[PDB]
């Protein structure tokens, strides 16, 4: 959008900060949930907690209105195409919260049927441990995503950030090479 054509002066910085504040608030989750993690997501929406306090009570039934896709449960092989379709049918900017161990790495179900982490099919922004994560853990992960969204760049700043993140990522060794103290 034209907000991405703005010059990199103070104008772009203020547009970025206001857009981040606006998007961190009103972060409507998609009406999407796979398993017991979906039950904990509902509990988070439930009175004991209040997802609504964060402007996130409107679980967008359609992906068009959804801004955040809380996977919230295990993703089977047959479901990955559906989850990717839902992700693609959301409109940018989009974010994916991998709620629970099943959504983030497959969790305990390390077998043929489970995808072993939704990042196999959709870009994940935050991983949320737990099986299921208790609602406070979900709110913590959501606030972490809010912090990430606030510092989200735009336009030329976005391009520079992408280049810098690429440069940093090209150098990190794989986890299999962090042999610290391994005999």
């Amino acid at each position: 959008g034209l907000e991405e054509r703005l010059p990199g002066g103070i104008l772009l910085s203020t547009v970025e900060t206001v857009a981040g504040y606006v998007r961190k608030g009103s972060l409507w989750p998609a009406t999407f949930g796979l398993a017991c993690c979906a039950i904990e997501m509902m509990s988070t929406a439930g009175p004991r907690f209040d997802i609504a306090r964060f402007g996130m009570e409107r679980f967008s039934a359609t992906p068009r209105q959804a801004d955040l896709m809380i996977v919230a449960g295990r993703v089977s092989q047959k479901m990955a195409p559906v989850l990717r379709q839902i992700y693609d049918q959301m409109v940018e900017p989009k974010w994916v919260l991998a709620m629970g161990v099943c959504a983030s790495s497959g969790g305990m179900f390390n077998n043929y049927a489970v995808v072993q982490g939704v990042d196999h099919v959709v870009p994940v922004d935050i991983y949320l441990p737990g099986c299921p994560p208790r609602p406070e853990m979900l709110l913590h992960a959501i606030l972490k995503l809010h912090d990430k969204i606030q510092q989200m760049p735009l336009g030329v700043n976005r391009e520079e950030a992408i280049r810098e993140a690429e440069q940093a990522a090209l150098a990190v060794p794989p986890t299999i090479e962090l042999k610290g103290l391994l005999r």
């Binding site: 959008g1 034209l2 907000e3 068009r64 195409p81 559906v82 693609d88 049918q89 409109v91 900017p93």
Partner: protein, 122 residues
């Protein structure tokens, strides 16, 4: 002209607001082409092959068609009440009786439709 130009001004404000809102929707925010994004939402399932049959290239029956047909006539008929209602005091008893006869005729029609199952289906 008077008593309406305020309506015209408010309509101009609202139309400018709405068209500019559509323009902002199309022009502000990210835009990235994606065939999966643009295709019809079907609860995550692949949309039916384009073709045309049994829907878009076909018809969607409404089961309250009868009530729609009745709605046309009843809506156009009730509007007689408005001038009658406003001028009620000035018209006098004759107009009251005339409108009561008209309303009883409408009631006969309504009762025939209702009791013969016309208000059934949706």
């Amino acid at each position: 002209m008077a008593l309406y130009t305020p309506i015209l001004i408010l309509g101009a404000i609202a139309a400018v607001f709405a068209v500019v809102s559509v323009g902002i929707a199309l022009v502000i925010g990210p835009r990235r082409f994606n065939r999966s994004k643009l295709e019809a939402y079907e609860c995550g399932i692949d949309p039916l092959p384009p073709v045309a049959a049994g829907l878009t290239g076909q018809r969607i029956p409404i089961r309250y068609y009868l009530i729609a047909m009745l709605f046309i006539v009843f809506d156009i008929e009730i509007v007689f009440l408005y001038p009658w209602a406003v001028a009620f005091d000035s018209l006098g008893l004759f107009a009251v009786i005339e409108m009561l006869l008209f309303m009883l005729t409408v009631f006969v029609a309504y009762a025939y439709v209702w009791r013969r199952g016309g208000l059934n289906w949706d």
